[PDB]
Design a protein around this ligand. Structure first.
Ligand SMILES: C/N=C(\NC)NCCC[C@H](N)C(=O)O
Length: 64
C-alpha cells in the first residue's frame, strides 16, 4: 500500500461509516478499498448509497 492504515478493512465487510451528509455513523458495507489513499468505497445498508470514505472514518460494527 502507499499509505499504511492502522485500520484494517476488507471487501465484503460492513463497517460503520460516517455519512458525509449527516455527519453520523451508519452501517455501510465495503465494496472496494483504495490502499493508495487509504480510502474505501462503502455502500450504506438499507438506504443504498455509496461514498468513498477513509478507513480512519470506518468504525467497527456490532454482531459482525
Ligand atoms: C447513511 N444514511 C442515509 N443514507 C445513505 N440516510 C438517508 C436518509 C436521511 C434522512 N435524514 C433520514 O434519516 O430519514
Amino acid at each position: 500500500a502507499s499509505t499504511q492504515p492502522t485500520h484494517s478493512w476488507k471487501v465484503g465487510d460492513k463497517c460503520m461509516a460516517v455519512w458525509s451528509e449527516d455527519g453520523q455513523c451508519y452501517e455501510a458495507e465495503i465494496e472496494e478499498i483504495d490502499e493508495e489513499n487509504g480510502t474505501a468505497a462503502i455502500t450504506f445498508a438499507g438506504y443504498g448509497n455509496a461514498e468513498v470514505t477513509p478507513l480512519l472514518n470506518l468504525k467497527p460494527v456490532e454482531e459482525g
